[PDB]
Amino acid sequence: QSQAVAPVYVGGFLARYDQSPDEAELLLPRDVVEHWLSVALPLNINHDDTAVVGHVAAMQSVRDGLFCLGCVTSPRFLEIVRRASEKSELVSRGPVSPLQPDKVVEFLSGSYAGLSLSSPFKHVALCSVGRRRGTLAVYGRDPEWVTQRFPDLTAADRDGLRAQWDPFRSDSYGLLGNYVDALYIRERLPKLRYDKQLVGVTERESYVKA
Amino acid sequence: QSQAVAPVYVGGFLARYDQSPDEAELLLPRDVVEHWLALPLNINHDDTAVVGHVAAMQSVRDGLFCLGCVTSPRFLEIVRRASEKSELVSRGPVSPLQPDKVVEFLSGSYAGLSLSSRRCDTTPFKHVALCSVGRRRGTLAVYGRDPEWVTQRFPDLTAADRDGLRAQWQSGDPFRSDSYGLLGNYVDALYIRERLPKLRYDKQLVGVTERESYVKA
């Protein structure tokens, strides 16, 4: 069991420039960011400030939007997620060809398949889809394994990050309650099955379930 | 707390005769059903998680119809708490209907029926399962507080149909799971191809519009 309640790294885009944000406010041009960039802005479930599970390791805008890495730590949340994946036929099926099963990672990769910003910079959030477009969450045990999952990324902005990287007041009832709300986010797969094409990431080489 | 964790009812078609299954092993015709004709009512086919039982099996004109009943003090307890922390459950039902957290959460989390039977190559009818979407089409799951109320939601259902159904339905808590057990199930649903769309079809099909019930699709 011990190789499950160990940190989980999640990485991805919080904004996508070359993507006209069809929605309101969410619009977010590089223009602010650099300027916009101390505190310990945390990582929570769909924003609930009583469901935090770690920190936003580090951020750093690059040629194609804003990118960040988190680090799920909540020795309680991870503990729920584990026994959760205990009974999830998606989890029991496993990852692809060469990748190795990681129950705790696969679950998080599937229930919260995307990141969502909120802002200096309030916080980052794991959710079932992203407000913006192309903010697919990529989970992993190793942060760099994660980083190289996104074709775009050069070496620099990668080593930019590499020169950077139990707050859980919730429960199975919290998680049970957020899931119903997500089961109705209209055609969640598209917005999702779109984001993995937007940044390259695919099921052939990552845990992304989308 | 007591108004909530009271017995809950669920009705709906298990199979539609005038529909072609999307896979041969799903073929379940009239004369078969009729031939075959207290089955347990579990969640997502989980043999450990049995929240109640089926109260009626009725082969009507359009297909195999059944009315269930969630009775587990443990399962209805988990559900009650989870509807509190839901965004959809606080938004409320359709204007004329009264709020019912338990029936809503349930009517959104397990919006489909899925029967268990032998391979249609004294118990051919294994059980009935609540799950996020049925495999066979037209299996919306209308959950109610009144078993009559759940039938009246199906246009196709005749009076003579509801009667034959009434005569039927008129170790303590069966649950053998817990909340974390129910957890890993919602993921699995989030990846059923065309979940919300498959449901919307089931609604307009069986007739159970939403502006007259609790469905969420």
UniProtKB/Swiss-Prot annotation, chain B:
Changing residue 127 to E: 12-fold loss of protease catalytic activity. Changing residue 127 to A/Q: 22-fold loss of protease catalytic activity. Changing residue 190 to R: 1800-fold reduced catalytic efficiency. It catalyses: Cleaves -Ala-|-Ser- and -Ala-|-Ala- bonds in the scaffold protein. The active site is at 45 (charge relay system), 114 (charge relay system), 127 (charge relay system). It comes from the Viruses. It is found in: Host nucleus. Exists in a monomer-dimer equilibrium with the dimer being the active species. Protease that plays an essential role in virion assembly within the nucleus. Catalyzes the cleavage of the assembly protein after formation of the spherical procapsid. By that cleavage, the capsid matures and gains its icosahedral shape. The cleavage sites seem to include -Ala-Ser-, -Ala-Ala-, as well as Ala-Thr bonds. Assemblin and cleavages products are evicted from the capsid before or during DNA packaging. This is Assemblin.
